[PDB]
């Protein structure tokens, strides 16, 4: 028996997208929900929710334990894009060929749509049905650290301050460490939801950190080249050593080999 990532991604992406859709039921001021759904339901790879389910499932958890957190992660990812596209930031006029949130609804609504998604992410983790509350709190804490000044937002800030040819290699590492912070918390949250012991959470953390780095190397070899691609390989190789789980680890090993 051999493992097809394309099938897995297809199966998972389907279940994730119905969950995303169900999470935002349209009421009161319909424009806010519309603006949220517009960015959240515009398709994509959905790697972040999938990493979460992967990690949870590998450790013995179920889709039902991780699904809310998985949607939460995608909501956070979405709102970072909504905010990043704003004129005051990257000033993007379209994304995946479709116009960006603010171009459809206005900068004001876009800002609020992002805010709504960010807070809803936490609300949603906390409404997770069948999981001890202690685990959910840990996810919420880690999610907080990943998204804020010590993570995603932190990275975006350093990124903006460097947006300079003389930029150091360590300034490149802090910038890309924060997109890894989102990525790390995907597998970390999954593990915690499953009831993983701290050593496992660290195992996954380091796996996530390594993958995160590798992604930005190859995206740079489109930050680079013959030795750049060597590093990306050493790192994905170290990661793909979570052999202790054997067959259960196929999705994560597969997913890693995005080179």
One-character DSSP codes across the chain: ----HHHHHHHHHHHHHHHHHHH----SSHHHHHHHHHHHHS----HHHHHHHHHHHHTT--HHHHHHHHHHHHHHHHHHHHHHTSTTTT--SEETTEEPHHHHH-HHHHHHHHHHHHHHHHHHHHT-TTS-HHHHHHHHHHHHHHHSTTTHHHHHHHHHHH--TT--HHHHHHHHHHHHHHHHHHHHHHHHHHT--HHHHHHHHHHHHHHHHHHHHHHH-----TTHHHHHHHHHHHHT--GGGGGGGHHHHHHHT--
84 appears as a binding residue in the annotation: yes
90 appears as a binding residue in the annotation: yes
Binding residues for Mg(2+): 84, 90
Binding residues: 84, 90
């Amino acid at each position: 028996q051999g493992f097809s990532l394309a099938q897995y991604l297809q199966e998972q992406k389907t279940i994730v997208e119905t969950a995303l859709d169900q999470s935002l039921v349209i009421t009161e001021p319909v424009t806010i929900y519309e603006a949220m759904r517009y960015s959240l339901l515009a398709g994509g790879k959905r790697l972040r929710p999938i990493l979460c389910l992967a990690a949870c499932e590998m450790l013995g958890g179920t889709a039902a334990m991780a699904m809310n957190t998985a949607c939460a992660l995608e909501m956070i990812h979405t709102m970072s894009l909504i905010h990043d596209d704003l004129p005051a930031m990257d000033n993007d006029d379209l994304r995946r060929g479709k116009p960006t949130n603010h171009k459809v609804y206005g900068e004001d609504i876009a800002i609020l749509a992002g805010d709504a998604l960010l807070s809803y992410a936490f609300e949603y983790v906390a409404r997770t049905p069948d999981v001890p509350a202690e685990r959910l709190l840990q996810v919420i804490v880690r999610l907080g650290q990943a998204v804020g000044a010590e993570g995603l937002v932190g990275g975006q800030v350093v990124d903006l301050e460097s947006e300079t040819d003389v930029a150091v290699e360590t300034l490149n590492f802090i910038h890309t460490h924060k997109t890894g912070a989102l990525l790390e918390v995907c597998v970390t949250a999954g593990a915690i939801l499953a009831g993983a012991k701290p050593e496992e959470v660290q195992l996954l953390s380091r796996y996530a950190q390594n993958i995160g780095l590798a992604f930005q190397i190859v995206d740079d070899i489109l930050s680079l080249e013959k030795s750049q691609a060597e590093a990306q390989k050493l790192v994905a190789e170290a990661i793909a050593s979570l052999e202790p789980y054997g067959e259960k680890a196929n999705p994560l090993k597969a997913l890693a080999e995005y080179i």
